[PDB]
Amino acid sequence: SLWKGLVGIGLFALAHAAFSAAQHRSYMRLTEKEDESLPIDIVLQTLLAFAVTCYGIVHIAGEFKDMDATSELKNKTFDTLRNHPSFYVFNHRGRVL
Amino acid sequence: SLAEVVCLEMVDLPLTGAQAELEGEFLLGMFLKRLSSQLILLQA
């Protein structure tokens, strides 16, 4: 179940990016520049977090299945089919034991 | 002496340590700088 760890790592890194960017914004409003864009590093970090997280969530999302009924009948025999549990009766050899 | 004032002004106060080192915070050098400052605030 490594894909779970992968997703948690993506999330942690993304949160780190958000924190870094908030404090950078504070720097901006403090130095009254309000002209410049974000440093590249934050951008790359968040984007890779996003991509990795999607690649992992696709895996852990589940698993597809055929829509042809007889696929799940390939392995089956009368012994299962015949029992009819709501019509059971016990007056048979086993009661000896 | 304040009974005759002529002109004045209002100035903003100085910074905390947090904001100072924050300014200090700002290729790989960029990343490691960021990390270091983050770890410092953390320890604080």
Termini Cα distance of chain A: 47
Q: With contact defined as beta carbons under 8 Å apart, do A44 and A13 qualify? A: no
Query: Of how many residues is chain A composed?
Result: 97
Quote the tokens at residue A12.
């942690």
Nearest-CA distance A49 → chain B (Å): 16
Burial class for B31, CB neighbours closer than 10 Å (0-12, 13-18, 19+): middle
Q: How was this one solved?
A: cryo-EM
Nearest one of A42, A28, A18 to B34, comparing CA atoms = A42
- Which residue of A41, A42, A43 to mutate against B (max B Cβ within 10 Å)? A41
Chain B residues touching chain A at CB-CB below 8 Å: 19, 22-23, 25-27, 30-31, 34, 38
CA distances from A54 to A16, A43, A46, A90 (A): 18, 17, 12, 56
Give CA–CA dist A50/A55, Å, rounded. Answer: 9
Coil, helix or strand at residue A68? coil
Burial class for A85, CB neighbours closer than 10 Å (0-12, 13-18, 19+): exposed
Q: With contact defined as beta carbons under 8 Å apart, do A57 and A11 qualify? A: no
Resolution of the coordinates, Å: 3.4
Quote the tokens at residue A65.
């299945």
Give CA–CA dist A63/A25, Å, rounded. Answer: 42
CA distances from B41 to A12, A74, B18, B37 (A): 18, 63, 8, 6
Give CA–CA dist A78/B15, Å, rounded. Answer: 84
Q: With contact defined as beta carbons under 8 Å apart, do A59 and A7 qualify? A: no
Give CA–CA dist A14/B30, Å, rounded. Answer: 18
